[PDB]
């Protein structure tokens with residue numbers, strides 16, 4: 001039995017590896033709060049009357065620089081976003097870099113500059129790190145860990161029947177932009193990745209409706225919106241009913257995804273949050289998102305239902321319904 | 337200008353890159369305590385009346401399994417040790433793995449088992465992680481971040497004139513064991529790496545003499561004892577006078593290092609701490625170390641002096657003195 005690319009593709013195949021190998025082999029998995037067995041965006045640790053939130057992501061995107069971003073902006077954004085979707089204000093990042101021998105120094109400088117500019121947007125400091133250089137022909141991997149503070153951690157398992165389901169903006173941008181760049185597809189300008197830190201979007205909603213009314217969040221990275229919704233449904237043991245027409249998709253992303261034969265629901269996003277909120281606070285949450293720049297295209301896309309537990313339904317036409325199937329993996333290689 | 341293997345070798349060449357490129361490019365570098373500009377084993381953040389300590393290390397050792405350890409034991413030990421030498425009790429680890437397509441699943445299982453066994457020694461939980469798979473022929477990289485709590489952070493810059501300098505055990509074991517394994521050198525058994533978590537050793541000293549009397553620590557990883565001592569001397573702006581005969585070296589390590597033509601002072605250790613303590617507490621500190629299993633071979637090896645600031649002197653014979661020169665880099669490739 002060998003490790004396959006699919007094991008790193010973030011959908012059902014990776015999930016099987018996490019449950020059957022990682023969780024079964026490691027025994028000390030919690031520091032007192034949300035731990036490894038939860039398989040959430042991060043872990044939580046009680047500290048005083050608040051919670052430390054801890055997360056880590058490796059980044060292996062190709063190419064290192066792409067329209068709308070780069071591995072540096074991705075490394076800061078992805079880790080800030082994992083903290084944000086746990087309800088945590090980012091307070092520190094750690095930066096591990098593994099660099100291929102022969103990489104031009106200017107590339108390292110460019111990546112670091114992008115990391116700093118992105119971190120300044122949050123704002124969050126990069127307070128510690130590590131540098132390794134290998135003879136392997138890898139260009140560069142960047143691995144960022146993050147610490148945040150949450151007064152009220154938000155899980156991916158807390159969705160309740162009746163809740164509204166929101167997305168903070170258009171879906172499919174990162175994965176489709178990346179594939180379009182590789183394939184020479186472009187319109188008046190190249191499609192841009194959405195990679196960006198979105199703590200400001202989450203914070204805006206919390207300040208408006210209160211943490212208690214944010215019932216679940218995930219950032220729809222590898223394997224996309226579909227994976228994120230299926231995970232929330234499964235872990236919350238509820239059904240999710242989505243109106244397909246209400247999912248925001250950039251016209252250029254729709255067109256390119258058609259040319260590529262790739263579903264925009266199944267590819268990583270890098271500047272988005274999926275949020276599940278108390279029914280009576282849905283419109284307030286939506287308005288709070290839309291008042292921000294990064295949440296300007298936010299939409300309510302569905303609702304949590306009591307039947308079809310652990311499933312996601314897509315509503316089309318005048319009422320017709322089918323399943324939004326959880327991908328086996330993100331179809332875009334080296335997407336993150 | 338290109339990135340060279342030396343930039344990942346942990347001595348003067350890497351230090352130049354950190355100062356001239358990393359520190360000059362990143363602008364947000366501190367979360368309120370020891371930050372990136374200190375270039376210490378980790379960073380610190382005020383929280384209540386204590387401090388959160390944060391660290392990260394990538395691990396790229398070859399081979400993945402070696403006498404005395406493996407990349408999994410190394411990943412847990414190295415990050416626990418970086419927390420320990422900041423004065424921090426480990427409370428959580430994060431585990432990023434980047435795996436080469438085609439690696440046998442049993443290798444991943446073995447690495448995870450070793451991580452768990454090592455973590456259980458501390459004890460510390462692995463609470464969050466990430467898995468990426470790349471087509472590159474790398475086998476596996478493991479990147480661990482750690483969070484600890486320190487009541488009283490210990491820097492690498494706090495050495496005071498008159499202080500005693502201790503090491504917790506024999507020097508050179510990891511690097512020399514690794515090179516000996518690669519080269520087919522062995523005695524009755526193969527030389528073993530010392531890779532192990534040593535929070536218990538540091539804690540033992542603190543419980544005996546108090547944190548205030550531990551003035552500086554570093555773990556002598558890449559570029560060895562020499563690098564660690566030179567760093568403490570430079571950052572504390574003091575001289576360090578070492579009695580060469582008092583530095584514990586395993587007889588087999590001495591012999592092998594002679595055959596290899598490599599200095600045991602210049603290669604990474606993975607189960608050791610260099611500690612600088614108040615003069616009047618030196619013997620108590622030494623006794624506390626020696627009562628532990630992992631510190632059983634601890635020795636007082638020198639003292640901090642007012643002249644030769646930023647330098648390390650080696651005393652031999654009946655009083656003769658030369659410089660212990662800071663290495664340009666660890667001479668052992670892929671040592672960590």
Ligand SMILES: Nc1ncnc2c1ncn2[C@@H]1O[C@H](COP(=O)(O)OP(=O)(O)OP(=O)(O)O)[C@@H](O)[C@H]1O
Nearest residue numbers: 010018039040041057221222431433464465466467
């Ligand atoms: N090698 C590993 N060791 C320990 N835990 C892991 C490992 N890989 C993944 N995990 C855990 O599995 C769960 C799912 O991880 P995943 O990386 O999909 O989360 P994510 O970062 O939110 O998504 P993405 O990596 O696509 O951004 C998380 O709780 C994570 O902590």
Ligand SMILES: Nc1ncnc2c1ncn2[C@@H]1O[C@H](COP(=O)(O)OP(=O)(O)OP(=O)(O)O)[C@@H](O)[C@H]1O
Nearest residue numbers: 095097128129130131346354375376377393557558
């Ligand atoms: N790519 C990077 N980005 C930010 N900070 C870095 C980076 N590489 C190293 N650092 C910082 O440089 C200092 C020296 O790092 P180094 O990795 O030598 O520490 P160490 O982990 O104690 O040693 P070793 O890696 O050999 O175990 C540390 O303070 C670390 O936080």
Ligand SMILES: [Mg+2]
Nearest residue numbers: 010221222223
């Ligand atoms: Mg995921």
Ligand SMILES: [Mg+2]
Nearest residue numbers: 041082219221
């Ligand atoms: Mg996530």
Ligand SMILES: [Mg+2]
Nearest residue numbers: 057078082221
């Ligand atoms: Mg992530």
Ligand SMILES: [Mg+2]
Nearest residue numbers: 130131392393
């Ligand atoms: Mg390091």
Ligand SMILES: [Mg+2]
Nearest residue numbers: 346557558559
């Ligand atoms: Mg070092």
Ligand SMILES: [Mg+2]
Nearest residue numbers: 377418555557
């Ligand atoms: Mg260190």
Ligand SMILES: [Mg+2]
Nearest residue numbers: 393414418557
């Ligand atoms: Mg280290």
Ligand SMILES: [Mg+2]
Nearest residue numbers: 056057466467
């Ligand atoms: Mg991840």
